[PDB]
C-alpha cells in the first residue's frame, strides 16, 4: 500500500506546483496524510492559512 500512496503523492507534487500552492513537501505530506484520515477539507484550507499566519505574527 505504501508503494501506491508514494507514487500518488509524487504525482500530487507536480499538480500542486502548477496550481501555485503555498505547499512545500512537508505540509504536502502532513495535509495529504490528514486528508487520508478524512475530515472536511474546506476547513483544512482555512486552518493552514491560519497556522502560517499565526507563526508569522511571532516573526
Amino acid at each position: 500500500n505504501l508503494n501506491a500512496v508514494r507514487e500518488t503523492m509524487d504525482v500530487l507534487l507536480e499538480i500542486s506546483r502548477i496550481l501555485n500552492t503555498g505547499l512545500d513537501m512537508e505540509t504536502l505530506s502532513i495535509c495529504v496524510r490528514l486528508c487520508e484520515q478524512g475530515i472536511n477539507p474546506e476547513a483544512l484550507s482555512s486552518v493552514i492559512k491560519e497556522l502560517r499566519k499565526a507563526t508569522e505574527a511571532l516573526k
Binding site: T8, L19, N20, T21, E26, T27, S45, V47, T55
Partner: protein
C-alpha cells in the same frame, strides 16, 4: 502518522540557529490556531472549473496537462478538494517560441505583433529583475549608510 508530521511541520517553523521550549510554545500557537475555525459536487469538476479559468488567460498546455493527470488520478479526491482552495496562497528563449525556420511544419502564418510582442516581454521579464537590481543596490545602501550617530547599525547598540 499525522502526529509525527505535525511535529516535523513545527520543526520547520522553528528557526534553527536552548531551543527546546520554543517548539512547545509554537505547538501552543499551532493548536490554538488549529481549533479556531473548527469552533465555528465531485472532486475532479473543481479542477475542470479552474482549468477553464487557466485557458482564458492564455497558457493552453498547462490546462492540457492539468486535465489529463486528474483523469488518470481518478482511474485522494479530498487532496484535490484541499488544493482547489490553496491555489491562491502560492508565491506572489529555448528554441521554440516563434520558430518558423526549422521543422516539418508548414511556414504559413500572418502578422499581428502580439506573438512577437509577448516575445519582447519574454526578454523584458528577465530585464525587469536585472534592472530593479541596479536601482535596489544603491537605495538599499544609502538607507543604511545615512542615519543618526549611535543608532546607525545596531551592533553599536551592544
Amino acid at each position: 502518522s499525522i502526529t509525527q508530521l505535525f511535529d516535523d511541520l513545527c520543526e520547520a517553523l522553528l528557526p534553527a540557529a536552548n531551543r527546546k521550549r520554543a517548539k512547545r510554545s509554537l505547538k501552543k500557537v499551532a493548536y490554538n490556531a488549529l481549533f479556531t475555525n473548527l469552533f465555528q459536487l465531485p472532486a475532479r469538476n473543481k479542477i475542470l472549473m479552474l482549468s477553464f479559468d487557466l485557458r482564458v488567460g492564455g497558457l493552453g498546455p498547462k490546462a492540457d496537462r492539468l486535465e489529463e493527470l486528474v483523469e488518470e488520478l481518478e482511474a485522494v479526491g479530498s487532496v484535490l478538494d484541499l488544493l482547489v482552495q490553496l491555489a491562491g496562497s502560492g508565491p506572489p528563449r529555448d528554441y521554440f517560441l516563434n520558430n518558423k525556420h526549422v521543422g516539418r511544419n508548414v511556414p504559413y502564418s500572418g502578422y499581428d505583433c502580439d506573438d512577437l510582442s509577448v516575445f519582447e516581454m519574454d526578454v523584458q521579464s528577465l530585464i525587469s529583475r536585472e534592472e530593479c537590481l541596479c536601482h535596489s543596490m544603491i537605495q538599499e545602501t544609502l538607507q543604511v549608510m545615512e542615519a543618526a550617530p549611535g543608532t546607525g547599525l545596531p551592533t553599536v547598540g551592544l
